Amino acid sequence: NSIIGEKYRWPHTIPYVLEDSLEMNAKGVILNAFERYRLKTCIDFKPWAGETNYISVFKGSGCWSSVGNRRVGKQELSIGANCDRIATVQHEFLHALGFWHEQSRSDRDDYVRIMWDRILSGREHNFNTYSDDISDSLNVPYDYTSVMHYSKTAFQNGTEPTIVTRISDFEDVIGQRMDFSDSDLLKLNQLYNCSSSLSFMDSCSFELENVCGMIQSSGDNADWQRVSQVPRGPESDHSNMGQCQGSGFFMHFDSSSVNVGATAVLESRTLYPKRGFQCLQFYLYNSGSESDQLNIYIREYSADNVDGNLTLVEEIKEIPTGSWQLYHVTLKVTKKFRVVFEGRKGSGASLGGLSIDDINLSETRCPHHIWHIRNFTQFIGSPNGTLYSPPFYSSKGYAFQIYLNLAHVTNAGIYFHLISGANDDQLQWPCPWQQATMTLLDQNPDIRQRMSNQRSITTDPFMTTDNGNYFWDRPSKVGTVALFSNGTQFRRGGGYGTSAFITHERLKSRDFIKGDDVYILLTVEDISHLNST
Amino acid sequence: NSIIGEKYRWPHTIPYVLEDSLEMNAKGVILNAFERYRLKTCIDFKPWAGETNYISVFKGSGCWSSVGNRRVGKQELSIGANCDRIATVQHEFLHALGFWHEQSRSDRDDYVRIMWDRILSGREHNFNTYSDDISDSLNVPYDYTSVMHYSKTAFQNGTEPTIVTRISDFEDVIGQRMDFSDSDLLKLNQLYNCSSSLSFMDSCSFELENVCGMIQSSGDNADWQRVSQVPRGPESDHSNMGQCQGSGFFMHFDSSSVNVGATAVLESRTLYPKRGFQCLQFYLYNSGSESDQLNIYIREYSADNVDGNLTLVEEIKEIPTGSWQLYHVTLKVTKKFRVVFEGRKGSGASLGGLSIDDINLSETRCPHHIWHIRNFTQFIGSPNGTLYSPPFYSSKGYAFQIYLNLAHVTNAGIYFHLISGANDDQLQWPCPWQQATMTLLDQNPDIRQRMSNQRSITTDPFMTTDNGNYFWDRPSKVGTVALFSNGTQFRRGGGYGTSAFITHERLKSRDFIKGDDVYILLTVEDISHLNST
Ligand SMILES: *[C@@H]1O[C@H](CO)[C@@H](O[C@@H]2O[C@H](CO)[C@@H](O[C@@H]3O[C@H](CO[C@H]4O[C@H](CO[C@H]5O[C@H](CO)[C@@H](O)[C@H](O)[C@@H]5O[C@H]5O[C@H](CO)[C@@H](O)[C@H](O)[C@@H]5O)[C@@H](O)[C@H](O[C@H]5O[C@H](CO)[C@@H](O)[C@H](O)[C@@H]5O[C@H]5O[C@H](CO)[C@@H](O)[C@H](O)[C@@H]5O)[C@@H]4O)[C@@H](O)[C@H](O[C@H]4O[C@H](CO)[C@@H](O)[C@H](O)[C@@H]4O[C@H]4O[C@H](CO)[C@@H](O)[C@H](O)[C@@H]4O)[C@@H]3O)[C@H](O)[C@H]2NC(C)=O)[C@H](O)[C@H]1NC(C)=O
Ligand SMILES: *[C@@H]1O[C@H](CO)[C@@H](O[C@@H]2O[C@H](CO)[C@@H](O[C@@H]3O[C@H](CO[C@H]4O[C@H](CO[C@H]5O[C@H](CO)[C@@H](O)[C@H](O)[C@@H]5O[C@H]5O[C@H](CO)[C@@H](O)[C@H](O)[C@@H]5O)[C@@H](O)[C@H](O[C@H]5O[C@H](CO)[C@@H](O)[C@H](O)[C@@H]5O[C@H]5O[C@H](CO)[C@@H](O)[C@H](O)[C@@H]5O)[C@@H]4O)[C@@H](O)[C@H](O[C@H]4O[C@H](CO)[C@@H](O)[C@H](O)[C@@H]4O[C@H]4O[C@H](CO)[C@@H](O)[C@H](O)[C@@H]4O)[C@@H]3O)[C@H](O)[C@H]2NC(C)=O)[C@H](O)[C@H]1NC(C)=O
Ligand SMILES: *[C@@H]1O[C@H](CO[C@@H]2O[C@@H](C)[C@@H](O)[C@@H](O)[C@@H]2O)[C@@H](O[C@@H]2O[C@H](CO)[C@@H](O[C@@H]3O[C@H](CO[C@H]4O[C@H](CO)[C@@H](O)[C@H](O)[C@@H]4O)[C@@H](O)[C@H](O[C@H]4O[C@H](CO)[C@@H](O)[C@H](O)[C@@H]4O)[C@@H]3O)[C@H](O)[C@H]2NC(C)=O)[C@H](O[C@@H]2O[C@@H](C)[C@@H](O)[C@@H](O)[C@@H]2O)[C@H]1NC(C)=O
Ligand SMILES: *[C@@H]1O[C@H](CO[C@@H]2O[C@@H](C)[C@@H](O)[C@@H](O)[C@@H]2O)[C@@H](O[C@@H]2O[C@H](CO)[C@@H](O[C@@H]3O[C@H](CO[C@H]4O[C@H](CO)[C@@H](O)[C@H](O)[C@@H]4O)[C@@H](O)[C@H](O[C@H]4O[C@H](CO)[C@@H](O)[C@H](O)[C@@H]4O)[C@@H]3O)[C@H](O)[C@H]2NC(C)=O)[C@H](O[C@@H]2O[C@@H](C)[C@@H](O)[C@@H](O)[C@@H]2O)[C@H]1NC(C)=O
Ligand SMILES: *[C@@H]1O[C@H](CO[C@@H]2O[C@@H](C)[C@@H](O)[C@@H](O)[C@@H]2O)[C@@H](O[C@@H]2O[C@H](CO)[C@@H](O)[C@H](O)[C@H]2NC(C)=O)[C@H](O)[C@H]1NC(C)=O
Ligand SMILES: *[C@@H]1O[C@H](CO[C@@H]2O[C@@H](C)[C@@H](O)[C@@H](O)[C@@H]2O)[C@@H](O[C@@H]2O[C@H](CO)[C@@H](O)[C@H](O)[C@H]2NC(C)=O)[C@H](O)[C@H]1NC(C)=O
Ligand SMILES: *[C@@H]1O[C@H](CO)[C@@H](O[C@@H]2O[C@H](CO)[C@@H](O)[C@H](O)[C@H]2NC(C)=O)[C@H](O)[C@H]1NC(C)=O
Ligand SMILES: *[C@@H]1O[C@H](CO)[C@@H](O[C@@H]2O[C@H](CO)[C@@H](O)[C@H](O)[C@H]2NC(C)=O)[C@H](O)[C@H]1NC(C)=O
Ligand SMILES: *[C@@H]1O[C@H](CO)[C@@H](O[C@@H]2O[C@H](CO)[C@@H](O)[C@H](O)[C@H]2NC(C)=O)[C@H](O)[C@H]1NC(C)=O
Ligand SMILES: *[C@@H]1O[C@H](CO)[C@@H](O[C@@H]2O[C@H](CO)[C@@H](O)[C@H](O)[C@H]2NC(C)=O)[C@H](O)[C@H]1NC(C)=O
Ligand SMILES: *[C@@H]1O[C@H](CO)[C@@H](O)[C@H](O)[C@H]1NC(C)=O
Ligand SMILES: *[C@@H]1O[C@H](CO)[C@@H](O)[C@H](O)[C@H]1NC(C)=O
Ligand SMILES: *[C@@H]1O[C@H](CO)[C@@H](O)[C@H](O)[C@H]1NC(C)=O
Ligand SMILES: *[C@@H]1O[C@H](CO)[C@@H](O)[C@H](O)[C@H]1NC(C)=O
Ligand code: NA
Ligand code: NA
Secondary structure (H helix, E strand, O other): OEEOOOOOOOOOEEEEEEOOOOOHHHHHHHHHHHHHHHHHOOOEEEEOOOOOOEEEEEOOOOEEEOOOOOOOOEEEEEEOOOOOOHHHHHHHHHHHHOEOOHHHOOOHHHOEEEOHHHEOOOOOHHHOOOOOOOEEOOOOOOOOOOOOOOOOOOOEOOOOOOEEEOOHHHOOOOOOOOOOOHHHHHHHHHHOOOOOOOOEEEEEOOOOOOHHHOEEEOOOOOOEEEEOOOOOOOOOOOOOOOOOOOOOOEEEEEOOOOOOOOEEEEEOOOEOOOOOOEEEEEEEEEOOOOOOEEEEEEEEOOOOOOOOEEEEEEEEOOOOOOOOEEEEEEEOOOOOEOEEEEEEOOOOOOOOEEEEEEEEEEOOOOOOEEEEEOOHHHOOOOOOOEEEOOOEEOOOOOEEEEEEEOOOOOEEEEEEEEEOOOHHHHOOOOOOOEEEEEEEOOOOOOHHHOOOEEEEEEOOOOOEOOOOOEOOOOHHHHOEEEEOOOOOEEEEEEEEEEEEEEEHHHHOOOOOOEOOEEEEEEEEEEOHHHOOO | OEEOOOOOOOOOEEEEEEOOOOOHHHHHHHHHHHHHHHHHOOOEEEEOOOOOOEEEEEOOOOEEEOOOOOOOOEEEEEEOOOOOOHHHHHHHHHHHHOEOOHHHOOOHHHOEEEOHHHEOOOOOHHHOOOOOOOEEOOOOOOOOOOOOOOOOOOOEOOOOOOEEEOOHHHOOOOOOOOOOOHHHHHHHHHHOOOOOOOOEEEEEOOOOOOHHHOEEEOOOOOOEEEEOOOOOOOOOOOOOOOOOOOOOOEEEEEOOOOOOOOEEEEEOOOEOOOOOOEEEEEEEEEOOOOOOEEEEEEEEOOOOOOOOEEEEEEEEOOOOOOOOEEEEEEEOOOOOEOEEEEEEOOOOOOOOEEEEEEEEEEOOOOOOEEEEEOOHHHOOOOOOOEEEOOOEEOOOOOEEEEEEEOOOOOEEEEEEEEEOOOHHHHOOOOOOOEEEEEEEOOOOOOHHHOOOEEEEEEOOOOOEOOOOOEOOOOHHHHOEEEEOOOOOEEEEEEEEEEEEEEEHHHHOOOOOOEOOEEEEEEEEEEOHHHOOO
16 A cells, blocks of 8 residues: 655655645645644645645646655645545545555455446556555555545446445445544554654543543542542443443542532643644533533643643533533643643532543644534434524624535535625625535544544635526525524525535444534634635 | 653664673573563664664663663663563663653652652662653653552662552552553654564454454355354453453354354465564354364465465364363464464354454464463462462473462462473483573453563572572472372472562453453573573
8 A cells, every 4th residue: 555665755744835726625625634634643734945845736637646755846736626625635645645545455356346347448547556566555454444445436437336345344335535544544654653743632531540640639628530420420421332331431520519619620731732722622511500610721831930820711601411512612822731620519409510521632723613413313314304503603704504414315415504694784795715614523532533524615706606696695685585493584595515425324433423412513714815825 | 751862862773782790580581571672662672783882781789771872882781680570671671762760750749759758878869850851751641550660669768658649549559560551652652753563463353344354255155254242152252351241343153054064264464474483372262062173274475376375384173162262373484474264163063153352463482381270360369379280391391380379468479390200311400591481461452452470580500409409400309299180299399489470459450360261371491592692
């Protein structure tokens, strides 16, 4: 799978150029793809400063790349039409880093059969095998879930598949387009001898007695206890639910046995930031009162104060009872710090306390908005699987809604819609170059093992409708009349996304559904600064 | 914990000299310690050929080492009296590689308290802390189970401990002397950017549908099935038992539904040996007939034959029913190969079949003899916890027995005894320099995550008894009269080992006991070639 040769190795930081030919949406997606490499690998990217060999990302015919550092200077990489997908950009960069397709492995014929008469004339070069003297498997087995593995339909001539997996169970498994596989990362990190990453900071599921070096100290006689269960709730930890349930642990602040006002803190070990912006995320459970609250502080260690600078950064109040709730906290720490979790028993009828699990800290931006869908499984393949998100306002002030269609018998669809907002009178119309990134979260206990499904679209102010008007024009002017859950009327603009966001079989895999809950993360930002590069 | 600086980094292969001052037993143990580094790290060792900087292992006062590559040329490392323990040698080499003690971590005072007035005058230098500008923690938390962490008694003046863990649960946990911790390896592999190892080849627990790339093909209509359970047995896989049981898998050859003589093969992926000698190990379960057998073949791929050279290397017949059985198969493959597992239904009343789990392949020597103790837990702290192994013959022909004492209220003891054998008339007496290595196996599903408890002793032909005679002289001449399980009388020589082999609390931890089974691996070899180095 990997190329044989030291000459084909790029430096750990790759010089890049995002050519002006590229689509605006492609540019924003290619930069998001680099963020996945910065969190899961030791491979970084930096804009070309005059280096001998660099990657020139441009809009050619389709999506393609050379395998490994060719040492030709300006090395082309095409992200053409319909290639503006994060996984597609990751795939083509894994080629550039020195990997062939997974079905190109020297042993591929022992796992899959290539139906040669079914491949489109002039696209066979994609199905070439490379022997031991040309390729290295790096002692990793054939991976059907590889992001470098083609789908059964890849360049098919008709309805019959080109790649027939010898084991029938993997027929629909091959060709997944979500993220790197655990096996993909293993080969890549072994090839460049990756030790760290730029974005990853910490993951804490409390599966060991040392609890990721988290210190619990209080002069209030109140303490955070490592438990596998709580009688009032939860019956089991978050980490393992659709796995084993009772063999997993979480921290718990019992409020039932403490005085009102009593606090107990849970501090992290000393953390060293490399970027200056962070995203703290965790799962919370409340079996106590609605008066009970969680406070997030940051203890920054400067030279002028070795005892630290404690600053309150979030007050989580009136936490909904009887279910695990995912929370995100935006941080902007530049010096070494400690995350401080403070539970507080309030004035109200309590019977349990506050539980915390799957704490993940990364140097990335938090999602702008979160759409949390409860009792999800009932909607899969349901006639009533036509869901509309609550309304949301973007950074620049545009009002938007998300439409998730699960009524289909095979694929789930997702669509971005502009809606009539309050700021509409002072906004630029048609909406110019706003990239809306919709992510179906794989709720894995470790951020590094998450294969989240993502799709991004950009608002084109020149995209004209099927009748004279602009697609992204003011919804009051081009949209359809709709009704909010309370009864208030509004105008829903055109819907833009995909009909094949994820298959129902993939949706029901990994941890996209966890505790019958689903989280679709949203980030809408202006990307107009990418037209001039 | 790790030293700050690039100048302190040794090359991946360390030049060494095992000085003649060293004890014979120390020499054999230091070479065994290198074998642990070759399997779990990318750090290799080679005898000094004239390199500028090298490690000079000699017998000084106690066990000590400099932290990191000091770049002084001949870098001393002392393995003095009573330091001839694998973990002690690993500890002192982790110092040499660039690590301080775990209780030397800049944040150590947040986890442990140093009782300074209780440390022996002149041994405080072992309890020094090194701040961020001098040390790096490499984003790994404080590890109480670290092999680099001192015991609570370390250089104590009296009965009161010098290291008091702030959390009382870790009081007896600190100071373990078995092997590297998962956290130790993580820091070390990150420091030298380790990708591979010399000895590790493969680990297969069948926890994924792709089954480590293992191909099952047969022209007999017989097949190996990936199951979580078998109605006749086993009720659950081996990998997870004292964890979850039913969420784990294993391969099964159902013999109940096939004709007599029918075979099904399970092949491995193409494997590439680096040393030329291997050790295949797996766990077997039989719910079928005693006539049912397992055949192990090797399919070696040479240039003159691309179809391979299939050779039968083991015939496992009359496998005991209703329990997981650990097996070892010695291999000497030099070219790329495939391990071939062949199940065969025999002539006898069957009701199930053959099950296989936790397959581990490493480029190491297999244990000479295996002492398998069933229903172990009943003996811990029992007056009848005085166990003697069955008799065994060494490579050179000496007869020996192992004594395991579990009757003690806190610690388990192990002792090596020479016994009267058949070859005794033609053997050299007293027995000269035979290293007997006793290993309490941590039955972890992954060989790389095994923290097996090991102790080695060497027969000194000058070691004189408490009354004129030689300790290792002919047992018929110096030993005591004893009785074999069947009633036959023999002479049991002197017992040499330790009274603190493992504590009962450590014995009951990890996977030393699994399915109430224990395996003590034995290797007895002549080490007389180490006197001249
Ligand atoms: C049935 O269901 C329907 C659907 O749910 C219901 O419909 C909804 O009803 C709500 C209630 O009527 C509507 O809420 C109102 O929303 C508007 C708009 O909110 C957004 O825009 C704000 C402005 O952003 C601009 O400015 C910032 C910088 O300041 C820029 O960064 C932005 O880019 C943006 O700039 C663009 O626009 C300006 C022009 O506006 C241009 O000049 C620029 O060039 C740009 O183009 C923004 O501030 C809002 O964000 C805040 O609020 C969020 C929600 O609370 C919160 O998540 C954010 O963090 C942020 O918080 C801050 O403000 C809140 C208070 O709102 C604080 O609590 C918080 O601490 C922060 O400080 C958002 O993005 C909003 O302006 C309205 O607010 C007025 O009224 C509320 C009280 O109702 C007051 O609290 C406000 O102060 C404000 O008061 C105005 O009026 C005063 C006189 O009365 C006057 O004195 C003040 O000066 C001020 O003008 C409402 O909150 C909702 O929009 C609507 N949705 C839809 C789709 O229809 C329906 O009502 C329901 N019916 C029933 C019966 O149930
Ligand atoms: C109550 O309980 C008690 C405890 O359990 C019982 O006591 C036991 O009883 C057994 C039965 O009586 C005893 O078994 C006998 O063991 C001896 C010794 O075995 C060991 O040594 C063998 C020789 O090794 C030397 O040579 C090799 C190279 O060839 C070297 O590498 C060695 O270093 C070593 O060299 C030293 O010694 C020589 C001198 O001997 C010097 O010259 C050198 O300088 C060195 O110092 C060795 O071959 C044995 O290993 C084989 O057997 C193992 C067990 O089967 C097996 O694990 C090994 O893999 C290996 O296998 C090979 O051989 C077996 C057959 O034994 C094959 O199946 C296999 O395929 C392999 O080829 C071991 O290390 C042994 O010699 C005896 O064997 C004779 O008798 C058996 C049948 O009983 C025959 O099968 C043999 O061929 C042999 O026959 C002799 O006699 C013939 C005439 O009758 C003659 O013609 C032949 O030429 C030959 O001389 C026995 O197997 C056991 O030792 C004893 N234990 C104790 C502690 O007391 C008690 O009996 C029981 N009572 C009751 C009633 O229940
Ligand atoms: C103890 O910590 C305090 C908090 O630090 C912050 O939080 C922690 C957790 C980390 O994330 C830190 O990285 C972070 O700084 C310190 O106070 C902070 O001081 C900084 C300046 O050093 C100050 O920054 C300013 O922020 C505004 C943005 O507005 C914020 O604050 C308001 C009011 O609270 C709030 O409503 C907003 O939502 C925002 O959060 C920004 O516009 C400023 O820009 C100016 O300076 C830049 C310099 O490059 C210049 O280019 C611009 O043109 C412009 O003039 C500036 O960045 C933080 O707001 C403030 N934190 C809070 C919560 O108020 C504290 O620092 C000391 O006290 C301060 C009052 C000030 O005197 C500082 O100089 C002192 O160092 C620190 N104390 C010690 C002893 O270390
Ligand atoms: C197809 O495979 C056969 C098996 O190969 C072995 O097994 C596989 C699984 C791998 O582990 C291989 O690395 C391994 O070789 C091949 O047959 C083998 O050929 C080798 C020679 O190439 C031969 O080696 C000799 O072994 C003896 C030790 O005795 C062993 O065998 C006996 C009898 O079976 C058995 O009772 C013992 O327990 C041992 O297992 C050793 O003394 C020999 O030493 C001589 O040669 C060395 C050379 O360095 C010299 O220094 C010495 O002084 C001395 O003369 C030698 O190493 C293997 O025994 C034999 N395997 C078996 C099971 O018999 C096979 O090779 C071809 O056929 C052979 C008959 C012979 O003509 C070879 O030259 C041929 O290559 C191979 N076939 C093909 C086409 O590839
Ligand atoms: C999630 O569903 C429960 C129950 O819904 C029922 O089961 C579905 C599978 C489907 O058949 C529905 O038609 C049924 O009505 C909702 O109600 C909760 O029920 C539990 C019962 O133990 C009760 O304790 C909760 O308090 C109820 N919740 C509320 C808010 O009343 C629940 O509301 C659904 N969740 C959402 C967000 O709609
Ligand atoms: C392992 O123990 C079983 C049962 O022993 C009993 O339980 C112990 C905890 C202790 O209290 C002993 O004194 C008891 O005698 C032995 O017997 C097996 O029992 C099962 C019962 O289901 C039976 O199916 C097996 O066939 C029995 N095994 C044999 C060989 O008869 C068992 O023998 C002990 N194992 C060994 C190696 O001694
Ligand atoms: C897809 O299949 C068709 C049918 O095989 C190919 O079209 C031609 O079909 C005729 C017979 O009807 C053959 O003789 C030709 O060789 C085919 N090829 C061409 C180039 O004309 C078609 O080419 C296939 N591939 C593509 C790219 O469409
Ligand atoms: C991989 O190991 C090498 C050992 O040389 C490290 O490379 C050096 O890193 C320093 C910074 O720490 C640079 O100044 C040097 O230029 C690097 N030298 C070489 C030869 O590349 C590297 O940092 C290790 N990787 C990690 C992440 O630990
Ligand atoms: C162990 O503790 C004893 C007692 O504190 C030390 O012995 C001396 O004790 C006297 C008082 O009885 C002190 O005044 C001395 O300072 C002690 N030290 C010496 C060197 O005499 C003893 O030294 C301690 N440490 C060792 C290494 O035994
Ligand atoms: C760590 O990465 C470096 C990349 O340079 C690899 O080092 C080279 O390895 C080749 C053999 O594969 C040697 O001939 C060179 O001398 C090495 N160069 C340097 C600068 O060290 C190294 O092999 C990688 N480690 C692993 C195990 O993949
Ligand atoms: C309609 O929605 C309910 C939940 O309110 C769900 O249980 C049901 O299955 C859906 N209807 C059908 C016909 O599937
Ligand atoms: C790119 O940005 C500049 C900003 O000044 C703008 O003038 C230009 O029109 C933009 N290019 C296109 C093709 O819209
Ligand atoms: C003696 O051995 C038996 C097993 O045979 C064990 O169950 C028992 O506990 C032991 N005796 C005592 C007093 O512990
Ligand atoms: C070391 O080995 C040599 C082998 O010839 C032997 O002569 C010598 O006596 C041995 N040394 C000792 C100290 O026994
Ligand atoms: Na957990
Ligand atoms: Na298993």
